[PDB]
Amino acid sequence: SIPKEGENIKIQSYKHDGKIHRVWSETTILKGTDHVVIGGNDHTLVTESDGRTWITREPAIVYFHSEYWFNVICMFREDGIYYYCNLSSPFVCDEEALKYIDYDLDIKVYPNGKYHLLDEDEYEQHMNQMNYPHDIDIILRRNVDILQQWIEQKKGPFAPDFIKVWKERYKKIR
Numbered sequence: 001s002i003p004k005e006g007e008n009i010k011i012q013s014y015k016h017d018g019k020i021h022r023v024w025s026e027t028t029i030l031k032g033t034d035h036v037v038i039g040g041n042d043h044t045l046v047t048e049s050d051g052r053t054w055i056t057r058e059p060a061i062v063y064f065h066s067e068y069w070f071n072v073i074c075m076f077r078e079d080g081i082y083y084y085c086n087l088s089s090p091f092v093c094d095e096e097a098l099k100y101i102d103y104d105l106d107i108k109v110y111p112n113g114k115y116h117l118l119d120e121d122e123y124e125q126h127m128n129q130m131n132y133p134h135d136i137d138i139i140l141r142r143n144v145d146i147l148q149q150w151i152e153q154k155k156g157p158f159a160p161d162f163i164k165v166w167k168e169r170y171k172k173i174r
């Protein structure tokens, strides 16, 4: 339930109804504690809910937390660091994969710092279709605001020093 440094793990995201959403085949673990998992991936296979596949185009650092309802992908592109933030259940890890539930809402952060809250329409549809309970709705809306504050504070994976440390750590181990 705590992956080891240098372990190659699968990441499996689900929807609230239990169907798989998206699977990443290979992520190398850089840090594994009780609260935080940090990993790196680069040209990993990605599997869609219909089984269709594609391969990621650039290195990324992934950040997972046991007590926050979000996780963060930090993508290294030509014109800087992009963040893609999934509102989510907190993660659980076992011998199959690190697993979480994707809850539709996402935030994209551009290299200039500007962020956009995405998928309010997708969230409203799924919350009605899959009958998300009221307490999950409260938690998710409260975690959108926490994530915006973390981005504005440059907290956690949004810290420039976080990027420098884990980018260089992953470059060495790969």
Ligand SMILES: [Mg+2]
Pocket (backbone or CB within 6 Å): 085, 086, 087, 102, 103, 104, 105, 106
């Ligand atoms: Mg998402």
Ligand SMILES: [Mg+2]
Pocket (backbone or CB within 6 Å): 104, 105, 106, 118, 119, 122
């Ligand atoms: Mg979405």
